[PDB]
Design an enzyme around this catalytic site. Structure first.
Site, PDB file in Angstrom:
ATOM      1  N   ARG A  72     -13.835   3.631  16.255  1.00 21.80           N
ATOM      2  CA  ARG A  72     -14.299   4.045  17.254  1.00 21.80           C
ATOM      3  C   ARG A  72     -15.767   4.801  16.563  1.00 21.80           C
ATOM      4  N   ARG A  85      -8.363  12.769  22.492  1.00 22.85           N
ATOM      5  CA  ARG A  85      -6.885  12.067  22.365  1.00 22.85           C
ATOM      6  C   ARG A  85      -5.813  12.234  23.637  1.00 22.85           C
ATOM      7  N   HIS A 143       1.242  -1.222   0.177  1.00 19.90           N
ATOM      8  CA  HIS A 143      -0.101  -0.290  -0.079  1.00 19.90           C
ATOM      9  C   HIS A 143       0.766   1.592   0.154  1.00 19.90           C
ATOM     10  N   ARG A 182      -4.625  17.993  17.768  1.00 17.81           N
ATOM     11  CA  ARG A 182      -4.968  18.501  17.206  1.00 17.81           C
ATOM     12  C   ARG A 182      -6.711  17.484  16.874  1.00 17.81           C
ATOM     13  N   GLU A 202      -9.075   5.843  14.135  1.00 17.75           N
ATOM     14  CA  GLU A 202      -9.885   6.450  14.586  1.00 17.75           C
ATOM     15  C   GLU A 202     -11.024   6.183  14.557  1.00 17.75           C
ATOM     16  N   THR A 229       1.602  10.883   5.430  1.00 17.56           N
ATOM     17  CA  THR A 229       0.040  11.195   4.329  1.00 17.56           C
ATOM     18  C   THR A 229      -0.444   9.589   4.035  1.00 17.56           C
ATOM     19  N   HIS A 260      -1.440   9.279  20.463  1.00 20.25           N
ATOM     20  CA  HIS A 260      -2.780   8.331  19.704  1.00 20.25           C
ATOM     21  C   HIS A 260      -3.097   7.129  20.407  1.00 20.25           C
ATOM     22  N   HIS A 309       2.097  10.224  18.036  1.00 21.26           N
ATOM     23  CA  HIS A 309       1.228  10.363  16.504  1.00 21.26           C
ATOM     24  C   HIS A 309       1.672  11.793  15.941  1.00 21.26           C
ATOM     25  N   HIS A 310       1.498  13.092  16.645  1.00 19.81           N
ATOM     26  CA  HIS A 310       1.606  13.888  15.125  1.00 19.81           C
ATOM     27  C   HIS A 310       2.088  14.861  16.629  1.00 19.81           C
TER      28      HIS A 310
HETATM   29  C1  LIG Z   1      -0.187   6.649  10.865  1.00 17.96           C
HETATM   30  C2  LIG Z   1      -0.880   7.782  11.006  1.00 17.96           C
HETATM   31  C3  LIG Z   1      -2.498   7.720  10.275  1.00 17.96           C
HETATM   32  C4  LIG Z   1      -2.727   9.332  10.594  1.00 17.96           C
HETATM   33  N1  LIG Z   1      -4.053  10.001  10.062  1.00 17.96           N
HETATM   34  C5  LIG Z   1      -4.686  10.619   9.903  1.00 17.96           C
HETATM   35  C6  LIG Z   1      -6.686  11.165   9.183  1.00 17.96           C
HETATM   36  O1  LIG Z   1      -6.499   9.913   8.775  1.00 17.96           O
HETATM   37  N2  LIG Z   1      -6.972  12.166   8.917  1.00 17.96           N
HETATM   38  C7  LIG Z   1      -5.564  13.263   9.611  1.00 17.96           C
HETATM   39  O2  LIG Z   1      -6.141  14.810   9.874  1.00 17.96           O
HETATM   40  N3  LIG Z   1      -4.511  13.176  10.336  1.00 17.96           N
HETATM   41  C8  LIG Z   1      -3.898  12.214  10.148  1.00 17.96           C
HETATM   42  N4  LIG Z   1      -2.822  11.946  10.929  1.00 17.96           N
HETATM   43  C9  LIG Z   1      -1.259  12.986  10.654  1.00 17.96           C
HETATM   44  C10 LIG Z   1      -1.892  13.505   8.766  1.00 17.96           C
HETATM   45  O3  LIG Z   1      -1.515  12.671   8.416  1.00 17.96           O
HETATM   46  C11 LIG Z   1      -0.645  13.986   8.876  1.00 17.96           C
HETATM   47  O4  LIG Z   1       0.284  14.198  10.046  1.00 17.96           O
HETATM   48  C12 LIG Z   1       1.220  14.114   7.934  1.00 17.96           C
HETATM   49  O5  LIG Z   1      -0.011  13.871   6.717  1.00 17.96           O
HETATM   50  C13 LIG Z   1       1.113  15.519   7.590  1.00 17.96           C
HETATM   51  O6  LIG Z   1       1.609  15.880   6.244  1.00 17.96           O
HETATM   52  P1  LIG Z   1       2.613  16.810   6.051  1.00 17.96           P
HETATM   53  O7  LIG Z   1       3.349  16.875   4.333  1.00 17.96           O
HETATM   54  O8  LIG Z   1       3.013  17.707   6.767  1.00 17.96           O
HETATM   55  O9  LIG Z   1       3.587  15.504   5.624  1.00 17.96           O
HETATM   56  P2  LIG Z   1       4.347  14.195   5.676  1.00 17.96           P
HETATM   57  O10 LIG Z   1       3.372  12.787   5.016  1.00 17.96           O
HETATM   58  O11 LIG Z   1       5.298  13.638   7.157  1.00 17.96           O
HETATM   59  O12 LIG Z   1       5.214  14.604   4.774  1.00 17.96           O
HETATM   60  C14 LIG Z   1       6.535  14.698   4.548  1.00 17.96           C
HETATM   61  C15 LIG Z   1       8.269  14.842   3.945  1.00 17.96           C
HETATM   62  O13 LIG Z   1       9.201  15.341   3.895  1.00 17.96           O
HETATM   63  C16 LIG Z   1      10.869  14.502   4.092  1.00 17.96           C
HETATM   64  N5  LIG Z   1      11.321  15.519   4.526  1.00 17.96           N
HETATM   65  C17 LIG Z   1      11.511  16.069   6.348  1.00 17.96           C
HETATM   66  N6  LIG Z   1      12.583  16.440   5.975  1.00 17.96           N
HETATM   67  C18 LIG Z   1      13.689  17.076   5.149  1.00 17.96           C
HETATM   68  C19 LIG Z   1      14.651  17.105   4.652  1.00 17.96           C
HETATM   69  N7  LIG Z   1      14.813  18.346   5.596  1.00 17.96           N
HETATM   70  N8  LIG Z   1      14.583  16.858   3.129  1.00 17.96           N
HETATM   71  C20 LIG Z   1      13.840  16.946   2.569  1.00 17.96           C
HETATM   72  N9  LIG Z   1      13.285  15.509   2.444  1.00 17.96           N
HETATM   73  C21 LIG Z   1      12.711  15.794   4.505  1.00 17.96           C
HETATM   74  C22 LIG Z   1       9.650  13.349   4.481  1.00 17.96           C
HETATM   75  O14 LIG Z   1      10.891  12.134   4.628  1.00 17.96           O
HETATM   76  C23 LIG Z   1       8.857  13.275   4.247  1.00 17.96           C
HETATM   77  O15 LIG Z   1       8.187  11.879   3.567  1.00 17.96           O
HETATM   78  C24 LIG Z   1      -2.400  10.561  10.925  1.00 17.96           C
HETATM   79  C25 LIG Z   1      -0.910  10.865  10.429  1.00 17.96           C
HETATM   80  C26 LIG Z   1      -0.353   9.147  10.787  1.00 17.96           C
HETATM   81  C27 LIG Z   1       1.597   8.719  11.143  1.00 17.96           C
HETATM   82  C1  HEC Z   2       6.285  -3.290   1.789  1.00 16.54           C
HETATM   83  C2  HEC Z   2       6.081  -2.716   1.180  1.00 16.54           C
HETATM   84  C3  HEC Z   2       4.888  -3.583   2.782  1.00 16.54           C
HETATM   85  C4  HEC Z   2       4.491  -4.505   2.941  1.00 16.54           C
HETATM   86  C5  HEC Z   2       4.399  -5.828   2.329  1.00 16.54           C
HETATM   87  C6  HEC Z   2       3.036  -4.179   3.554  1.00 16.54           C
HETATM   88  N1  HEC Z   2       3.320  -2.936   4.472  1.00 16.54           N
HETATM   89 FE1  HEC Z   2       2.176  -1.831   5.276  1.00 16.54          FE
HETATM   90  N2  HEC Z   2       0.936  -0.642   6.734  1.00 16.54           N
HETATM   91  C7  HEC Z   2       1.814   0.273   7.977  1.00 16.54           C
HETATM   92  C8  HEC Z   2       0.731   0.732   9.276  1.00 16.54           C
HETATM   93  C9  HEC Z   2       0.191   1.751   9.529  1.00 16.54           C
HETATM   94  C10 HEC Z   2      -0.864  -0.027   8.042  1.00 16.54           C
HETATM   95  C11 HEC Z   2      -1.874   0.076   8.754  1.00 16.54           C
HETATM   96  C12 HEC Z   2      -2.702   1.321   7.085  1.00 16.54           C
HETATM   97  C13 HEC Z   2      -3.130   1.745   7.776  1.00 16.54           C
HETATM   98  O1  HEC Z   2      -4.541   2.140   8.552  1.00 16.54           O
HETATM   99  O2  HEC Z   2      -2.783   3.295   7.379  1.00 16.54           O
HETATM  100  C14 HEC Z   2      -0.064  -0.874   7.188  1.00 16.54           C
HETATM  101  C15 HEC Z   2      -1.167  -1.537   6.609  1.00 16.54           C
HETATM  102  C16 HEC Z   2      -0.939  -2.779   5.552  1.00 16.54           C
HETATM  103  C17 HEC Z   2      -0.888  -3.960   5.314  1.00 16.54           C
HETATM  104  C18 HEC Z   2      -2.507  -4.171   5.427  1.00 16.54           C
HETATM  105  C19 HEC Z   2      -3.641  -3.236   5.743  1.00 16.54           C
HETATM  106  C20 HEC Z   2      -3.690  -3.208   3.996  1.00 16.54           C
HETATM  107  O3  HEC Z   2      -4.288  -4.732   3.815  1.00 16.54           O
HETATM  108  O4  HEC Z   2      -4.031  -1.985   3.294  1.00 16.54           O
HETATM  109  C21 HEC Z   2      -0.086  -4.966   4.837  1.00 16.54           C
HETATM  110  C22 HEC Z   2      -0.474  -6.373   4.123  1.00 16.54           C
HETATM  111  C23 HEC Z   2       1.188  -4.562   5.173  1.00 16.54           C
HETATM  112  N3  HEC Z   2       0.891  -3.763   5.373  1.00 16.54           N
HETATM  113  C24 HEC Z   2       2.344  -4.965   4.781  1.00 16.54           C
HETATM  114  C25 HEC Z   2       2.970   0.266   7.900  1.00 16.54           C
HETATM  115  C26 HEC Z   2       4.284   0.588   6.983  1.00 16.54           C
HETATM  116  C27 HEC Z   2       5.189   1.083   6.499  1.00 16.54           C
HETATM  117  C28 HEC Z   2       4.903   2.465   7.438  1.00 16.54           C
HETATM  118  C29 HEC Z   2       5.292   3.994   7.226  1.00 16.54           C
HETATM  119  C30 HEC Z   2       5.010   0.771   6.054  1.00 16.54           C
HETATM  120  C31 HEC Z   2       6.818   0.926   5.015  1.00 16.54           C
HETATM  121  C32 HEC Z   2       4.527  -0.388   5.078  1.00 16.54           C
HETATM  122  N4  HEC Z   2       3.670  -0.225   5.817  1.00 16.54           N
HETATM  123  C33 HEC Z   2       4.987  -1.206   4.321  1.00 16.54           C
HETATM  124  C34 HEC Z   2       4.379  -1.930   4.107  1.00 16.54           C
END
Ligand SMILES: Cc1cc2nc3c(=O)[nH]c(=O)nc-3n(C[C@H](O)[C@@H](O)[C@@H](O)COP(=O)(O)OP(=O)(O)OC[C@H]3O[C@@H](n4cnc5c(N)ncnc54)[C@H](O)[C@@H]3O)c2cc1C
Ligand code: HEC
Ligand code: HEC
Ligand code: HEC
Ligand code: HEC
Length: 570
Positions: free
Chosen positions: A380, A401, A63, A544, A377, A164, A364, A503-504
């Site tokens: 829930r 949160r 994904h 947030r 979330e 993101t 989170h 988380h954030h």
């Molecule tokens: C698992 C998860 C689930 C979440 N789900 C939601 C959701 O459903 N709804 C919601 O509102 N928010 C959610 N959030 C929060 C949302 O994801 C934002 O926190 C995130 O999208 C922020 O986007 P962004 O553009 O600011 O940065 P990011 O998506 O972090 O983009 C980052 C780029 O900068 C690159 N970078 C950083 N420093 C440098 C540098 N010096 N030079 C070059 N590249 C650099 C990094 O590697 C990064 O990839 C979630 C967060 C997480 C982790």
């Molecule tokens: C290497 C390319 C990867 C493989 C194979 C899979 N992942 Fe991921 N992964 C991550 C999260 C936080 C989740 C939950 C998804 C979300 O809710 O945002 C998942 C989910 C999966 C799943 C099941 C969900 C689906 O079927 O789409 C599988 C089978 C899976 N992942 C395998 C986190 C991360 C991550 C951190 C940034 C990385 C690099 C990868 N996952 C990459 C892989």
């Protein structure tokens, strides 16, 4: 024992097998040719994916969004690790494999060597420079490209989309078309009021207005680029159903990250992976003139530009830094991708940028310690209940949160269980992936679930029939839960052990509604420096609300891109 990839290949053809030259060396940080050679000989991701076992988890079909290189996992001259290893533990059999490890390197270390190279000429120009490839940056690559700037975007990891791409729960927006289609009466003001109450009224009201006010154009924008934001559900702290996500409850992150990646790339965005910006360049009465890039493979190089957009993300992955502010969190697990370490915050600070709210770190509440991933979330919001080790409920599950984590932390074992039914299950397609990850307990009855977890059957059962009455009456007499969507009565029954995670980061750069980065000396913008997304602060105050970070990144990223581009016309 030939063991690393290129040496293995050494045995067959040499150096021109992967490199353009028979002497060796890469020509660009994206590794264009080397991957191309890999694909000439072994097939490409579709084809690799095409042949894996029809059951579970293959490393060539995941994904992750956007272009994912071979060499981003199959390393040539050092051990190879699957990138997945950074978050899951699938224990793959990686040919020439090592284990996952990432050292934090200060953007400032190697100060002498960068200076020789800033001195050693300016190697290339462009209009707008965009740092980071998450939504803020991609949203901004589009919008700048739409305006005529030539854009160069740098991403430091080997794969794109930052945090993101992992988002799931949704993007908030008030007064939208999708809500019209579902008959949800909401108001931009309510969204404002929800944002302000929940960030304990320290949010900058000017930024929360724009974030609220532009939210629906910013759903429309995405739709017109090909997004599907028609599924609307509740997230905590909101009073109206406003979290947008793809049809059926599919997460938004991969969906939005990939529509925005496509569109940046379909305009002529020059995106460079493995390229980290380690400094923003300087001048007179501090005008931003370009930046210093450090390519993983081609080294330091200066790119001159008129405007510079900072879309670099937060620092929640760097527990060291997180811990200096809130020592409570020393040693907690994070939900973030590996590169969320602080980098662009330093960069901006080394440039005189102002900062605010850096000590407000969100945790989170429902992270899966077994899966090593966050449970959205939206489970829930969609109706799940949270329950402790005695089978009893301890809070309002759609609360803010800070509060939800606190309560879970004061229960036995610092952890609780998510309990939902089959209707909750089929109403949120993201649940289906926690299911594919083998971390969800399923009992055929409530009492059968209790055995599976290790909780008193009588009491769980008691708390579930108790909670259904509140759902019929519309009043939860236990905790104050304002939205009670589903009876939690269609068998089979599911459960998941959750516990808080870092988380954030709500704090960051100080900006104004134009995405302008303000100075610590003056209070006035640094000319030509702009920014958007979680690296900035002010939008979220001290907590947030779930849904507002993807809303922030689109809306603000669109603003920085348009704004930095006009700068370039003048
Ligand atoms: C698992 C998860 C689930 C979440 N789900 C939601 C959701 O459903 N709804 C919601 O509102 N928010 C959610 N959030 C929060 C949302 O994801 C934002 O926190 C995130 O999208 C922020 O986007 P962004 O553009 O600011 O940065 P990011 O998506 O972090 O983009 C980052 C780029 O900068 C690159 N970078 C950083 N420093 C440098 C540098 N010096 N030079 C070059 N590249 C650099 C990094 O590697 C990064 O990839 C979630 C967060 C997480 C982790
Ligand atoms: C290497 C390319 C990867 C493989 C194979 C899979 N992942 Fe991921 N992964 C991550 C999260 C936080 C989740 C939950 C998804 C979300 O809710 O945002 C998942 C989910 C999966 C799943 C099941 C969900 C689906 O079927 O789409 C599988 C089978 C899976 N992942 C395998 C986190 C991360 C991550 C951190 C940034 C990385 C690099 C990868 N996952 C990459 C892989
Ligand atoms: C394909 C399997 C390869 C063969 C054969 C050779 N190299 Fe390579 N090289 C390959 C990759 C995928 C990469 C990127 C980084 C990594 O190790 O994965 C590289 C990189 C280099 C570099 C740059 C190293 C750095 O600056 O960190 C050099 C100097 C290099 N390779 C040299 C080199 C020589 C001399 C080779 C013939 C003996 C050779 N490579 C073969 C992939 C492959
Ligand atoms: C053609 C000239 C090739 C290029 C370029 C690359 N690979 Fe390759 N690879 C090739 C052959 C003929 C073989 C041997 C097949 C066999 O008989 O087993 C391989 C082997 C691999 C492996 C297998 C390792 C193992 O299971 O121990 C891998 C993972 C692999 N090659 C990957 C790979 C990547 C990622 C490349 C780009 C840098 C690449 N190869 C280049 C042929 C050719
Ligand atoms: C990380 C997420 C990967 C990317 C991107 C690519 N590959 Fe891959 N590859 C990876 C793993 C973990 C494994 C081993 C599977 C196991 O557990 O045994 C592999 C394996 C290969 C092989 C071996 C044999 C085969 O399935 O034909 C080859 C030839 C191979 N990988 C090549 C390859 C190429 C050309 C890629 C680019 C499109 C590529 N891999 C991506 C991890 C990852």
């Amino acid at each position: 024992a030939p063991e690393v990839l290129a040496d293995f290949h050494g045995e067959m053809g040499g150096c021109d097998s992967c490199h353009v030259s028979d002497k060796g060396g890469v020509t660009n940080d994206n590794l264009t040719h080397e991957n191309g050679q890999c694909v000439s000989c072994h097939g490409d991701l579709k084809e690799l994916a095409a042949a894996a076992p029809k059951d579970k988890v293959s490393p060539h079909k995941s994904h992750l969004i956007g272009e994912i290189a071979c060499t981003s996992c199959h390393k040539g001259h050092e051990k190879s690790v699957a990138y997945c290893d950074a978050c899951h533990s699938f224990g793959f059999d990686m040919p020439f494999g090592g284990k996952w490890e990432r050292k934090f390197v200060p953007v400032d270390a190697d100060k002498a060597a960068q200076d020789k190279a800033i001195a050693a000429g300016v190697k290339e120009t462009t209009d707008v420079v965009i740092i980071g490839s998450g939504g803020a940056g991609l949203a901004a690559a589009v919008s700048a490209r739409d305006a005529g700037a030539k854009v160069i975007l740098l991403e430091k990891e080997p794969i794109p989309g930052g945090n993101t791409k992992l988002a799931a729960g949704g993007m908030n927006a008030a007064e939208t078309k999708p809500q019209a289609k579902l008959g949800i009466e909401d108001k931009k003001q309510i969204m404002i009021d929800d944002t302000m109450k929940g960030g304990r009224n320290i949010n900058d009201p000017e930024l929360v207005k724009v974030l609220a006010n532009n939210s629906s154009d910013s759903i429309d924008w995405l739709t017109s680029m090909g997004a599907d934001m028609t599924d609307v559900g509740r997230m905590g702290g909101a009073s109206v159903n406003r979290s947008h996500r793809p049809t059926g409850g599919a997460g938004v992150g991969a969906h939005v990250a990939q529509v925005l990646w496509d569109n940046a790339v379909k305009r002529g965005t020059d995106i460079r992976l493995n390229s980290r910006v380690v400094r923003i360049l300087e001048d007179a009465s501090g005008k931003v003139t370009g930046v210093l890039v450090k390519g993983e493979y081609t080294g330091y190089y200066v790119i001159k530009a008129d405007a510079v957009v900072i879309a670099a993300g937060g620092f929640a992955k760097n527990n060291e830094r997180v811990s200096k502010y809130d020592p409570k969190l020393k040693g907690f697990k994070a939900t973030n991708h590996p590169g969320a370490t602080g980098d662009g915050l330093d960069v901006a600070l080394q440039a005189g940028a102002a900062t605010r709210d850096l000590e407000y770190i969100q945790a989170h509440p429902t992270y899966s310690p077994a899966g090593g991933v966050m449970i959205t979330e939206a489970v829930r919001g969609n109706g799940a209940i949270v329950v402790n080790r005695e089978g009893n409920r301890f809070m309002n599950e759609i609360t803010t949160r800070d509060k939800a984590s606190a309560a879970i932390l004061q229960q036995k074992g610092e952890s609780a269980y998510l309990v939902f039914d089959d209707s909750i299950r089929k109403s949120l397609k993201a649940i289906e992936g926690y299911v594919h990850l083998n971390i969800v307990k399923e009992g055929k009855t409530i009492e059968e679930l209790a055995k599976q977890i290790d909780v008193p059957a009588a009491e769980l059962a008691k708390t579930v029939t108790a909670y259904n009455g509140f759902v019929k009456s519309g009043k939860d007499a236990q905790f104050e839960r304002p939205d009670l969507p589903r009876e939690l009565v269609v068998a089979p029954f599911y459960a998941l052990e959750i516990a808080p995670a870092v988380h954030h980061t709500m704090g960051g750069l100080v900006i104004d509604t134009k995405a302008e980065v303000k100075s610590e000396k003056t209070g006035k913008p640094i000319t030509g420096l702009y920014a958007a997304g979680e690296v900035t602060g002010g939008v979220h105050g001290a907590n947030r609300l779930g849904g507002n970070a993807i809303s922030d990144i689109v809306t603000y990223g669109r603003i920085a891109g348009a704004s930095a581009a006009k700068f370039a016309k003048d």
